[PDB]
Amino acid sequence: SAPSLEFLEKLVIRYLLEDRSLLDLAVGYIHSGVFLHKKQEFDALCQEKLDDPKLVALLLDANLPLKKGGFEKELRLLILRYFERQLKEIPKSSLPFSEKMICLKKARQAIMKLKQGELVAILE
Amino acid sequence: APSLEFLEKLVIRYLLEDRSLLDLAVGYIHSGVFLHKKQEFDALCQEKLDDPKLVALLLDANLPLKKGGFEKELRLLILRYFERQLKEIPKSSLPFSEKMICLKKARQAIMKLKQGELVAIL
């Protein structure tokens, strides 16, 4: 039942399409870089290109079930996924040693908070 | 009251004297936030503790720290960043809709900051 990342990115954007007040919240925590599948859709939604063919198709998709009060749990899972990936990617990266250290600690901390139910921003 | 350059040095000197404060700071700020002390911040993140600018800051005699005073100075540094966005975003090349979103983000950030919250600069 745990969704695919592409499904989760669609879901998150679909909530932002249906209720633009949720975009106001989400831009506190995520940016375009976070998305691995639906970056163009998020970008178009940010520039109110509301007739963009990708965004239209997502707004029209019949298989993305939204629920009252359900947005923040899916935003939190998208962010949690991003930081879980960081935990794998940082040790493989070119970052100076002390920055790998800092960044690993920050990703672990974020994962803790996300699971405590708190939203956490992705800066980098 | 404090110049931006002084606030930046004061923020970095807290981070230099206590690395646990860096752990807190990197939740909210990045080198791009700094206008005057970017090289120093980058040196501290890189643990280049003999960087000559970082050392000048370490040795500065006019940056007394207050116990528990860090978050006040970090919040002011974030507030000033978002106050500048209010001035600079309208003069940018961003398309209108994006200017709107960014400015609303800044106004909302400033409202939280004034209530004592830290807000991330993304």
In this structure, what CATH number is given to the domain that contains residue A60?
1.10.860.10
Q: Over the range A94-117, which residues count as b (16 or more CB within 10 Å of their CB) and which as e? A: ebeebbeebbeebbebbbebbeee
- Per DSSP (E only), the strands in B22-78 are none
B29, B97, B105: residue with CB nearest A27 = B105
Nearest CA among B55, B94, B109 for reference residue A121: B109
Distance between CA atoms of residues A9 and A92, nearest Å = 25
| Contact in structure between A14 and A59 (CB atoms under 8 Å) | yes
Interchain contact, B30 vs A124, CB within 8 Å: yes
Contacts of B5 (CB under 8 A, 6+ apart): B35, B36, B37
Contacts of A78 (CB under 8 A, 6+ apart): A8, A9, A12, A30, A34
Q: Residue A109 sits in which domain range? A: 1-124
- The identity of residue A21, as a single letter, is S
Distance between CA atoms of residues A49 and A53, nearest Å = 9
The tokens describing B18, both together, are 């206590």
| Contact in structure between A114 and A120 (CB atoms under 8 Å) | yes
The tokens describing A81, both together, are 């996924």
How was this structure determined? It was done by X-ray
Distance between CA atoms of residues B20 and A121, nearest Å = 19
Interchain contact, B23 vs A109, CB within 8 Å: yes
Distance between CA atoms of residues B7 and B63, nearest Å = 9
Contacts of B80 (CB under 8 A, 6+ apart): B4, B7
Neighbours of A93 (CB within 10 A): 11
Rounded to 5°, angle at Cα A42 from A37 and A45: 150
Distance between CA atoms of residues B49 and B58, nearest Å = 9
Interchain contact, B45 vs A99, CB within 8 Å: yes
Q: Over the range B102-118, which residues count as b (16 or more CB within 10 Å of their CB) and which as e? A: bbebbebbbebbeeeeb
Distance between CA atoms of residues B35 and A111, nearest Å = 31
N residues, chain A: 124
Nearest CA among A71, A94, A88, A57 for reference residue A23: A71
C-beta pairs of B61-65 under 8 Å, 24+ apart in sequence: B63/B9, B63/B10, B63/B13, B65/B10, B65/B13, B65/B14, B65/B17
- Exposed (0-12), middle (13-18) or buried (19+): which is A59, by Cβ within 10 Å? middle
Number of folded domains in chain B? 1
| Contact in structure between B75 and B113 (CB atoms under 8 Å) | yes
Nearest CA among B81, B92, B105, B104 for reference residue B32: B81
